[PDB]
Design a protein around this nucleic acid. Structure first.
Length: 66
RNA sequence: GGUCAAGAUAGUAAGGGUCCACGGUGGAUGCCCUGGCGCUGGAGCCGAUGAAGGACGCGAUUACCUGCGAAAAGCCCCGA
């Protein structure tokens, strides 16, 4: 979610995690359009989640290739 | 008391005037500060790593502002 249990993943295993959230985020976007969003907090959570993956994939790119 | 005569004089206000009472309109005066001005001192350049300044966006709901920038009213570390 946030500490060291996030960086264990390989190359395509990072792009995979993003894609699964973007898809969920879109299913929620469609849910919003048809008056079905009972859990709006889920929206920001996934956006915070995708941000974290994208931030870390840049940390590890510099904590190796310098 | 009655009739006639000769006199003289009053009230009525359609509307108006002055004063009084009570309102309405209006935003002066007073009180206040959420905002300004001056002087004294501090500080004093930003930009091809893309500035000043903008456009369009980012909200469960978002028209304006603010804050951001497709990682979008926020993501990571250190300190309080």
């Amino acid at each position: 979610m946030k500490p060291s249990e996030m960086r264990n993943l390989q190359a395509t295993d990072f792009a995979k995690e993003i894609d699964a959230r973007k898809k969920e985020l879109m299913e929620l976007r469609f849910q919003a359009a048809a008056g079905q969003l009972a859990q709006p907090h889920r929206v920001r959570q996934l956006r915070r989640e995708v941000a974290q993956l994208n931030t870390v994939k840049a940390e590890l790119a510099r904590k190796g290739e310098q």
